[PDB]
């Protein structure tokens, strides 16, 4: 199926984008490098699950993401508005976020057709929420102000 | 519609790519950071216009882009040949340019189907002309020579 | 054809991604900058071949890539496992690799329909093998250890 190549090619692109963001993270010594690396491991499992009726993808990583999301959102100021995508790390993570959401769209037809576990798409969903939150968090910890267009 | 998610997801990806290029710009103190940021604001308006028979997208930003395009092209040497994509900022802008053109392709079916203002697609068109010109301009102002393959 | 715009737009995106990786390469003075630049030239020829029953694309660049691939793989430790995408240059090249594979997927329908030379798709195939190998090579020459998830 060409849909499988498109899906696994885009989770590959996502993992590679995160690889580059990871390099900028470790340069400025932020602690959450290891979280990004762990996500790369799970994205490898996602690639295995996409190319195989379907391979079960356990909900463990989703619940771990949700835990990290709560950890960071509870540290951030309230936000009820879109932001402009706040530093090199943060902007790189926003690009990873958009690539993640494109990866999620490529997985939808495989879930619809029943060929992959719906947890794959759930994980990519929450991953894009995590990247959004982590970018805000990196921007805050760098002292960069959130820019909101009106 | 999946076409709407694809279109707004790619203008999101474009804005995020520009966010990263913006970080490299402001590091080397180039003046046109604020232009890139303003484009991010308009891309937010484009996302609103894409997700809504259709929402009117005013031609103001298009005419402002055309003004900036003329300002920079009038400073550049003549060019009648393709260039190889000239410095970190310039190459980042060339990547933003290609992402912009992909965003334009995702908007075409929505314009064809009458679901979004054709000015959306016109804006993305001229935005890719602007990014091409701005990259040449950044490369020139850095003293990097335009590389032309024969 | 919209398929032609999608294909040439993605080889454009690939060349631009490589342009940025090239900037990181030349900063750290790695020797293989000129190889990346030569690939940009061939990608220009690929764009010409895609937009034109079809234009012959000579197999010269494919054989040159294969020569470079052998040169680098013969310097690398054995690998029988996926790696996590090893330094700024290496991670940038992994992102170029994933973009390259997306470009290859966009060329397939044009080759299938007989509209472009099948050598175009062969070149993009081997280009993604080359970028994978070059990224491993840059990571090795930087002393960064290959990270393998189990
Ligand atoms: C199309 C759309 C987008 C598009 C384009 C957005 C644009 N205009 O540029 C894209 C794909 C880019 C997108 C992005 C995201 N979106 Co959105 N999106 C929508 C949507 C469907 C319409 C937005 C719109 O254009 N409104 C019209 C404009 C003129 O309204 P506005 O004056 O800007 O008012 C908006 C904001 O105040 C927003 N809002 C309210 N509370 C919050 C909180 C947060 C954190 C944000 C970011 C926005 C937000 O609500 C209004 C939108 O109606 C809304 C849901 C809806 N309204 O039906 C969701 C919505 C705004 N999105 C939402 C979120 C979560 C996001 C993302 C963080 C997702 C992600 N992980 O990437 C990003 C944020 C991007 C950024 N830079 O801030 C949430 C925000 C509330 C929340 N936390 O649950 C909403 C409400 C959807 C939902 N989950 O119920 N989205
Ligand atoms: C397919 C195509 C592309 C493809 C692939 C190009 C490739 N080969 O790598 C892609 C999508 C990548 C592309 C990119 C762009 N393109 Co284009 N493209 C075309 C096209 C349709 C064919 C080009 C081709 O392959 N010719 C075959 C090769 C062998 O010819 P060549 O020896 O290289 O000669 C070319 C150049 O001299 C070119 N040319 C002449 N004057 C100028 C001026 C400029 C600034 C440039 C960049 C090129 C250019 O004209 C000849 C092409 O026939 C032409 C229109 C046509 N010819 O029918 C437009 C054309 C060359 N594109 C054009 C432009 C504007 C661009 C972009 C700047 C658009 C953008 N904003 O991104 C970029 C430039 C990319 C770069 N690195 O320089 C213009 C250039 C003239 C102008 N300023 O109006 C043309 C003429 C289309 C038009 N608008 O009328 N394009
Ligand atoms: C789906 C798939 C991918 C997907 C997703 C991979 C994932 N899971 O994240 C994507 C598109 C990302 C991909 C990437 C590539 N792939 Co792939 N892929 C496949 C495939 C079809 C299934 C892999 C899988 O999920 N196995 C299930 C998991 C649980 O198995 P595993 O325990 O990880 O065991 C695997 C590895 O040991 C792998 N392997 C064995 N020897 C080698 C050597 C190398 C260098 C690598 C990278 C892997 C590898 O083989 C097993 C896979 O069955 C296999 C072929 C097959 N098995 O049918 C090819 C395969 C593993 N891919 C291969 C290669 C070449 C690559 C790329 C280097 C291509 C490129 N130039 O980008 C990259 C490497 C990415 C990276 N970070 O290392 C080769 C590796 C052997 C070789 N050198 O010929 C294989 C065997 C296909 C082939 N050519 O015959 N691939
Ligand atoms: C925030 C808004 O973004 C849109 N949305 C939700 N998931 C995706 C995705 N994977 N890609 C693009 N757009 C998406 C919906 O419209 C949501 O409400
Ligand atoms: C410069 C050449 O690029 C092609 N072209 C025009 N608009 C796009 C786009 N959005 N994406 C990709 N290719 C495009 C046409 O062939 C044009 O002539
Ligand atoms: C390594 C694995 O990646 C898949 N594969 C091969 N070519 C592509 C491509 N252009 N894009 C995405 N996935 C691809 C096949 O499944 C191959 O076996
Ligand atoms: K795409
Ligand atoms: Mg950098």
Numbering used by the authors:
A (entry chain A), B (entry chain A), C (entry chain A): 79 to 130, 141 to 173, 175 to 239
Extract from the study:
To gain structural insights into how the mutations impact AdoCbl binding, R190C and E193K ATR were cocrystallized with AdoCbl and PPPi, and the structures were solved by molecular replacement. Electron density that could be modeled as AdoCbl but not PPPi was present in the 1.8 Å structure of R190C and 2.2 Å structure of E193K ATR·AdoCbl. Both had four identical chains per asymmetric unit with an occupancy of one AdoCbl per monomer. Structural overlays revealed Cα RMSD values of 1.6 Å and 1 Å for WT ATR·ATP versus R190C·AdoCbl and E193K·AdoCbl, respectively, indicating that the mutations do not induce major conformational changes in the overall structure. AdoCbl was bound in the base-off conformation with Phe-170 positioned at a distance of 3.6 Å from the cobalt atom. An overlay of the WT and E193K ATR structures revealed only subtle differences in the orientation of the deoxyadenosyl moiety. Indeed, structural changes that might explain the profoundly lower affinity of E193K ATR for AdoCbl (±PPPi) were not obvious in the crystal structure. It is likely that the E193K mutation impacts protein dynamics by destabilizing the β−hairpin roof and, therefore, the active site architecture. Although Glu-193 makes a single electrostatic interaction with the amino group of the adenine moiety, it plays a role in stabilizing the β-hairpin roof over the active site via its interaction with Lys-78. Hence, the E193K mutation is predicted to primarily impair the chaperone function of ATR by weakening its affinity for PPPi and AdoCbl in the ternary product complex.
